[PDB]
Design a binder for this molecule. Structure first.
Ligand SMILES: COc1ccccc1NC(C)(C)C(=O)O
Lengths: 300, 257
């Protein structure tokens, strides 16, 4: 288990660590999060108590370095940094642990939730969507736009999700106009999977990452990407059986985790009714259909 | 965006544009089978593609053989229409290609947009006006060429005959749509109006009779009375009681989807 220490907590803030969250009071003796499970990416995120504008946070993997948080009073936010001095870092952590100045990552042993939400997400792929190569961790916030959003404005601060557009020359073979518009299997299997993603695990990773940025930051372009990647599969007549079974599991755990009170801004009614009730795969998503109908029957 | 009454003069400006109507592409008769089931029999159809400024009509005849062995024909028909419009545009010299294509039915928007992805500067637009282009098949010379075709065929017409020598394209389009609305409303009475007088004839190279300016005013009035009469017949309204402002108001409302 690994640790992300905090230099201090000079401003009141709600801190998120994966799907958990806790409040820290202005100048309270908080020096970080311990017992972070090794084996998964994680996200530490923030929402200032005095300015809920800009949710922001950092994706990281404790196997790739020793990271800590320090408040920057000039830029007004909590920043992740890497500590290259290994012996310094261990001694800082051990002191804060001895003084019990850290919250424990509260993982119930029955609970596979975080694994289920991040099964295909890898730090290396995050670092290609979020391009800031001098850091081993990746900053995301509420307002960052996606490449696709910008096409429809600063390019260095953008989310480089794979562009999906059903009415583009990429999606539609000349001469196969009706076929490719009504059945997205070409676009899914040849363009996206064989061409761009190389395999379904990378496709699912980006899908999972998009959901988590939508949920944790309220990032609207990420919510668009998540829905686009679902629709692309559901609107394809020919999908490998293992991808459909895994998609059902992926979506089930995303719908299970979504806060009920955010359903009206995180779920697109058109896309979900289309995917569950009219698409080619309308009958291939049993677990997702059952949780959606029992938890968000209004949306349908 | 969409095309309606506010930006109506745009139809007659110098940006090339085409109306596309797919209502006569897939045409069937429904009938009983020997076993008492119901079956359809297709007949030849046509794509109606019109330049409203010039009157040039590109009539693509849709031969029934194109439906042979195909499924979901009403859906295929939209995509076949979009394919043929796209092929027409590609066949035209660059300086003749349209800047806008206006579809009479909103279901043609995605099929045409997808077929025209290669032409990102051609705007594909719907229209709120109730255009009567389905009555094209009420023009005898057009119906004849469609029903006689034994193979796919494109035929070029000027649907305004020689009217533009005498009137503006705004007026010619108004005349056209009034004639076609009358023909769709009461085809028999409309054709009676147009042909009653034997001394006015249809030139071999024309679609409509050779009316003088004054006779066209008379014909146009008779067509409006025909439509108003049908309006009265349809909704059980006493048209004689109606004021001129009320009649104008009824017409404007009846010409909007
Ligand atoms: C003056 O009435 C109209 C004016 C213009 C178009 C149509 C109508 N009425 C009928 C022919 C009944 C219709 O089909 O709506």
């Amino acid at each position: 288990m690994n640790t992300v220490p905090f230099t201090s907590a000079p401003i009141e803030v709600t801190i998120g660590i994966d799907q958990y969250s806790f409040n820290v009071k202005e100048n309270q003796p908080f020096h970080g999060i311990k017992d972070i499970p090794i084996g998964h990416v994680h996200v530490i995120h923030f929402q200032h108590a005095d300015n809920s504008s800009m949710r922001y946070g950092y994706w990281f993997d404790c196997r790739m370095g020793n990271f800590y948080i320090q408040y920057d009073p000039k830029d007004g936010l909590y920043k992740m940094m890497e500590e290259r001095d290994g012996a310094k870092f261990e001694n800082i952590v051990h002191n804060f642990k001895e003084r019990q100045m850290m919250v424990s990552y509260p993982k119930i042993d029955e609970d596979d939730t975080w694994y289920n939400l991040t099964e295909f997400v890898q730090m290396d792929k995050i670092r290609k969507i979020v391009r800031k190569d001098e850091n081993q961790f990746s900053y995301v916030d509420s307002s960052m736009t996606t490449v696709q959003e910008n096409e429809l404005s600063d390019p260095a601060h953008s989310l480089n999700y794979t562009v999906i557009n059903f009415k583009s020359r990429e999606a539609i073979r000349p001469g196969h106009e009706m076929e490719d518009f009504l059945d997205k299997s070409y676009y899914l299997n040849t363009v996206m999977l064989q061409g761009i993603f190389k395999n379904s695990s990378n496709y699912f990773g980006e899908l999972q990452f998009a959901f988590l940025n939508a949920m944790f930051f309220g990032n609207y372009g990420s919510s668009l990407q998540w829905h686009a990647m679902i629709e692309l599969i559901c609107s394809s007549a020919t999908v490998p059986k293992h991808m459909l079974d895994k998609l059902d599991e992926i979506l089930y755990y995303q719908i299970k985790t979504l806060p009920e009170q955010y359903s009206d801004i995180l779920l697109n009614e058109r896309v979900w009714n289309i995917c569950l009730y009219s698409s080619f795969q309308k009958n291939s998503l049993h677990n997702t259909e059952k949780i959606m109908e029992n938890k968000y029957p209004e949306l349908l | 965006g969409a095309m309606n009454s506010s930006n109506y003069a745009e139809l007659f400006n110098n940006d090339i544009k085409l109306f596309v109507d797919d209502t006569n592409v897939y045409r069937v008769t429904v009938h009983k089978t020997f076993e008492g089931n119901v079956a359809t029999k297709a007949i030849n159809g046509c794509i109606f593609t019109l330049n409203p400024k010039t009157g040039h009509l590109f009539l693509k005849i849709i031969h029934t053989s194109v439906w042979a062995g195909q499924k979901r024909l009403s859906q295929l028909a939209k995509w076949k229409t979009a394919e043929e419009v796209s092929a027409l545009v590609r066949s035209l010299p660059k300086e003749e290609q349209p800047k806008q294509i206006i579809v009479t039915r909103k279901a043609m928007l995605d099929p045409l947009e997808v077929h025209m992805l290669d032409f990102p500067n051609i705007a594909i637009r719907p229209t709120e006006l109730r255009l009567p282009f389905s009555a094209a098949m009420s023009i005898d010379k057009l119906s004849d060429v469609v029903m006689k075709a034994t193979e796919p065929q494109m035929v070029l017409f000027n649907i305004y005959d020689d009217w533009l020598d005498r009137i503006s394209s705004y007026t010619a389009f108004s005349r056209l749509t009034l004639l076609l609305r009358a023909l769709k409303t009461n085809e028999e009475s409309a054709k009676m109006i147009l042909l009653s007088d034997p001394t006015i004839t249809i030139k071999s190279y024309h679609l409509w009779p050779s009316f003088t300016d004054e006779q066209w005013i008379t014909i146009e009035s008779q067509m409006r009375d025909l439509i108003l009469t049908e309006y009265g017949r349809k909704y059980n309204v006493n048209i004689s009681a109606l004021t001129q402002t009320e009649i104008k108001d009824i017409i404007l409302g009846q010409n909007i989807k």
